[PDB]
């Protein structure tokens, strides 16, 4: 949008219950400090296995947010 | 399968509730007009953020379907 | 970790209900024969369509597990 | 947006004057037959050379447009 | 070429005898409905195995063809 | 250069007139807050279409800048 | 298919006569020890040159086969 | 074309005014020593920043040219 | 780990003596300002040549660190 | 092999009869001017279509050859 | 080489002292159980950070080894 | 820099002692015939294994050097 610069910061979102909740936990955490959060893009789905089970879903994400002027 | 040509058309499927339902909404929509839908392949998971929440899951997909003869 | 070699074997996990359960079914199956399962990485989400519905979610995965000494 | 399916069709746009005009010529041509054109994504910049000059800029593009119901 | 838009549609071509014949079967099938077929690009070689033999070569392809005016 | 750490932050630059001006708008905006801006790398060209025209060029970019000591 | 895990093992198939025969030699060799061989995917075509001729076609392949229960 | 070998040499073209002129400067320079220049392909767009401005556009390119017989 | 968000910031580490020391110089520099540094991932190895020698090893890196609550 | 530098030059090999013969025509042509040709790697398979048939197979290739001392 | 099948198994090699020693530790470990080890290919360099230092270099690797007949 | 064309030639550098020395051996060899060598970029790390040891490190590299006028 009109001469807007967008910052695309990278995070890994995490949850013991799935891919989707891992993305929601990062979006939630990101919205506490960041404004004008517009789009995400999944970069990777990974995760920790413990006792032959998935202990944490780790979803990498790019968060696009609109830059406020300096 | 025996001299079958397959067409691989690209779509983005969408849902307010998750990645999986976004893929089901596109498969559903695709099956209304297309026949011999055989396989999908996820090309990207993206999505819109509004008010620091995920408003829509946008899952890119290739849909492989068997071409009927001309 | 200290001079540990890790083996990264590739599998496709499958489920009729979603991406997440497809990853859990492979992790479960892998843990029956393999020890020291540490991390997974999703390589692809694909799937079979039958009657314009998703019949199986097929999630490709790398499974990292720690190699026991020979 | 709310349960919208998007179709992502691929084209190469062309112009004797540059990359940007090549993208505008395809968007123009695409808008003559297609409705609800929303976003493009550049897939490749290529081009023909003739007499040691660039004769045509060929910009590959994905065009995302919203699917009307069937 | 001069302000020509090109459409790049994706297909999988198939044959029981090899990669090359799989590409020829798709080009043949594509030429029955499509005009101004100019170039192809191989996107993937895959295939079905049955009884420890290759039953079908499946060669993915992009077909570039020149768009006639609307 | 001699034991310099460089930070590579990601932005999307935007303009209604083209790819180049979209990169200049981000470089300009980045230089208002950042010092020792050294190189950029284009990660993607995308853009919004409105009324069958390109409304904004969106050029993704990595900005390499030299880190001042902490 | 219904909660089946698939193992995707990687091999390079080889032949002095071509790409296709190199894939057939690996599929043949793989079927001597492995059961439920379902699909292959070409990862790379490489090869040795000797005396300005191609001495061996080396085709990389992923072999997907269905895992029997443990 | 009929048993023609093509050589694909890689260059970075440069200009203080944009992406397009950077590609034209390389094509020009390449045509002074090379014959049968047929196609280019952009491999990357990068560039130097000086005083918070873009000092040079650096466009990577593959140049395809037809090989004359030895 | 349990609902932890991880930030994945990108840097280029530099050294006149090698790839490894270039990664150590960035990790060192990063640890002066950042806490809960957990993993790195090499994105690229590049470098400057001066007088036909390698003057600096430039190793790109993603640094994963655990986000403290806001 | 012991402190040998290898040069990896890129070519497109061409044939009206297939992928394999296209690779043989380039290897043949390359061996007329180049010595110590060791390995090739296929970078892409493309081709021209004329009258709904494949007129030329165009196989991209990297040719690795051992550098003689200067 | 003459109708040889090669198996390409994936491992992560580890060392507290660098990238190279991490590759040597995996090659060593692999040679204790595997015969006809021919080539490796680095797939990734990653690593653990502890107390703002690199605790382990983790180098991913493909190991190509020649398959003995079944 | 001001209307400079840069040539990006590809080589594999080799050493029995490591990745770094393999890059230094190629840079050294390249500087005997080439002038204005400016930057390298690692394209891959591979290597030969003999007797369960690494016999040669093979580091692929792009060498960017400034083109002198024709
Ligand atoms: C929020 C944000 C976009 C603001 O960007 P900005 O407009 O450049 O503003 P900043 O406040 O970062 O200003 C630049 C700062 O870096 C400093 N700086 C500038 N150039 C520098 C250099 N070469 N080396 C070191 N520091 C430098 C400035 O002095 C200033 O610091 P100061 O406030 O201590 O003086 C940016 O801080 C950011 O991208 N944050 C990431 C947030 C994130 O990813 N959160 C994840 C939540 S899940
Ligand atoms: C269904 C489909 C496979 C049929 O393919 P097909 O066998 O080639 O049949 P088509 O009906 O497209 O025939 C080609 C048409 O394009 C025209 N055509 C052929 N060459 C052309 C060219 N160079 N320029 C312009 N038009 C051309 C033909 O004249 C014909 O149009 P007409 O019916 O108006 O005469 C194809 O239409 C398709 O791929 N659709 C995409 C569906 C999709 O992705 N849906 C998403 C749902 S989620
Ligand atoms: C478990 C595992 C890591 C053990 O690795 P290892 O330490 O090398 O031990 P192995 O038992 O495989 O030993 C090597 C075997 O291959 C043989 N071998 C060695 N080199 C060989 C060659 N060039 N050609 C053929 N066979 C060879 C050895 O003789 C031995 O076989 P044997 O027991 O019949 O004598 C390995 O078997 C593995 O990676 N398995 C994959 C498991 C998997 O992916 N499961 C999926 C569950 S979802
Ligand atoms: C516009 C578009 C999205 C409409 O998609 P849709 O909702 O699926 O509707 P369509 O009419 O295309 O598809 C149904 C048609 O395909 C046919 N079809 C369905 N399944 C089929 C199969 N397996 N094999 C062959 N044909 C099939 C149907 O019979 C029907 O043909 P008909 O119209 O002759 O009855 C689709 O045509 C499209 O993607 N077009 C591409 C536009 C483009 O790229 N333009 C470029 C401008 S620069
Ligand atoms: C041939 C082709 C290029 C023609 O493209 P075109 O110039 O855009 O012409 P179309 O006939 O597709 O026109 C657009 C159609 O989609 C409709 N349409 C346009 N925008 C739409 C939207 N947002 N949602 C749904 N439908 C839409 C139009 O109403 C029109 O349908 P109609 O014929 O029922 O009126 C296109 O049909 C195509 O790409 N086909 C694929 C062919 C193929 O892959 N064949 C495989 C052979 S192996
Ligand atoms: C400028 C920049 C390089 C400075 O980096 P730096 O040397 O690490 O300095 P910072 O000021 O970021 O210091 C780290 C801060 O994060 C905090 N921090 C450190 N580790 C942390 C963790 N694990 N969790 C949460 N916060 C943490 C520190 O407490 C400090 O915050 P404070 O200022 O409230 O004390 C950095 O701010 C940056 O990369 N900014 C992005 C600029 C940008 O992209 N601008 C876009 C312009 S278009
Ligand atoms: C066939 C195959 C799928 C069977 O997988 P599986 O169900 O996991 O069963 P396996 O017997 O291989 O794995 C268990 C073995 O690994 C061992 N193992 C388990 N975890 C381990 C670890 N962390 N470290 C070392 N060894 C381990 C077990 O002790 C057992 O060894 P044993 O048989 O000596 O008791 C698997 O062997 C495989 O992937 N083979 C590759 C086949 C191939 O690539 N063929 C090429 C032909 S061209
Ligand atoms: C133009 C070109 C295709 C000619 O290719 P060719 O038909 O192989 O002809 P060449 O003249 O290169 O012949 C091979 C040369 O390398 C030598 N050579 C062959 N094998 C060799 C080896 N293994 N080690 C070292 N030298 C070798 C030959 O002896 C001969 O050199 P000579 O002329 O000193 O005897 C080639 O020079 C080229 O690709 N140049 C790049 C042009 C370029 O990128 N320009 C940039 C403009 S912006
Ligand atoms: C440390 C870090 C994770 C903290 O993230 P955080 O929890 O989001 O907290 P921050 O303080 O950075 O972000 C909020 C700031 O950005 C601002 N901000 C939020 N949304 C914004 C927007 N849309 N536009 C501009 N600024 C915005 C806030 O106003 C606040 O600025 P303030 O501190 O001046 O009030 C983050 O600063 C970071 O990623 N730093 C990079 C460190 C790095 O790369 N170091 C390299 C060492 S080698
Ligand atoms: C064969 C080859 C490896 C020889 O490499 P080499 O050892 O560097 O030897 P060269 O003869 O190229 O020596 C460098 C030449 O470039 C010149 N040169 C060096 N640096 C330069 C610069 N920065 N700008 C312009 N020219 C430069 C030298 O002056 C010399 O030219 P000259 O012989 O006119 O004096 C090289 O010519 C090559 O890679 N050719 C490609 C072959 C090919 O792809 N063939 C296709 C067959 S299908
Ligand atoms: C060594 C190796 C190449 C031998 O391959 P091979 O020639 O296929 O021989 P295998 O011994 O694996 O034979 C296949 C086994 O899997 C079984 N099998 C075959 N198809 C199967 C299927 N669909 N499901 C489950 N098991 C199957 C066979 O019954 C046989 O098991 P058995 O020994 O209990 O009878 C193979 O074991 C391998 O790739 N190992 C990995 C070694 C490795 O990565 N080591 C790391 C060192 S760092
Ligand atoms: C050094 C270099 C940049 C010079 O580039 P240049 O300015 O184009 O100069 P060249 O000398 O290559 O001139 C082009 C040559 O190819 C010939 N040529 C031009 N077009 C041609 C075509 N289509 N087919 C065949 N030959 C052609 C010219 O006739 C001339 O050869 P000649 O000297 O025998 O007359 C180029 O030789 C090069 O890139 N070399 C690679 C060096 C390298 O990789 N070294 C490795 C060191 S580790
Ligand atoms: C691998 C390959 C890629 C090509 N890519 C393009 C391209 O992107 N744009 C284009 O106009 N022509 C392309 N061509 C066609 C050539 O530009 C050229 O017109 C054709 O090879 C005939 O040239 P010749 O007469 O020199 O053989 C390509 C050809 C080959 C073999
Ligand atoms: C980077 C690299 C890649 C290679 N790839 C292959 C390959 O794909 N197939 C092959 O048979 N040999 C390959 N080789 C081995 C070479 O073909 C050759 O036999 C070896 O370098 C010895 O050659 P020399 O005696 O000319 O040094 C490769 C070597 C290197 C350094
Ligand atoms: Cl025609
Ligand atoms: Cl400055």
XYZ file of N, CA and C in Angstrom, chain K residues 1 6 9 18 27-28 31 34-35 38 43 55-56 60 64 66:
48
model
N 29.408 -46.738 -11.796
C 30.224 -47.839 -12.423
C 29.301 -49.037 -12.753
N 23.994 -47.529 -5.873
C 24.595 -46.803 -4.757
C 23.467 -46.394 -3.816
N 22.542 -42.670 2.151
C 22.012 -42.526 3.505
C 22.426 -41.171 4.137
N 34.804 -28.084 15.245
C 34.495 -27.468 13.965
C 33.690 -28.277 12.968
N 32.048 -39.754 9.246
C 32.664 -40.655 8.242
C 33.277 -41.865 8.968
N 33.969 -41.582 10.074
C 34.541 -42.577 10.974
C 33.467 -43.504 11.493
N 31.985 -45.653 8.736
C 32.888 -46.724 8.230
C 33.004 -47.968 9.142
N 29.578 -49.620 7.625
C 29.344 -49.565 6.172
C 30.615 -49.746 5.353
N 30.453 -50.430 4.221
C 31.542 -50.714 3.293
C 31.251 -50.017 1.963
N 32.061 -44.079 -0.705
C 32.644 -43.460 -1.891
C 32.684 -41.933 -1.854
N 24.739 -31.392 3.426
C 23.362 -30.893 3.273
C 23.017 -29.640 4.125
N 28.774 -24.920 21.071
C 29.032 -26.116 21.831
C 29.251 -27.334 20.919
N 28.505 -27.405 19.814
C 28.662 -28.496 18.834
C 28.374 -28.029 17.441
N 25.180 -31.772 8.525
C 24.410 -32.785 7.802
C 25.192 -33.288 6.608
N 27.265 -41.404 0.080
C 27.100 -42.345 -1.006
C 28.012 -43.543 -0.837
N 28.686 -47.790 -2.311
C 28.270 -48.768 -3.338
C 27.545 -49.966 -2.734
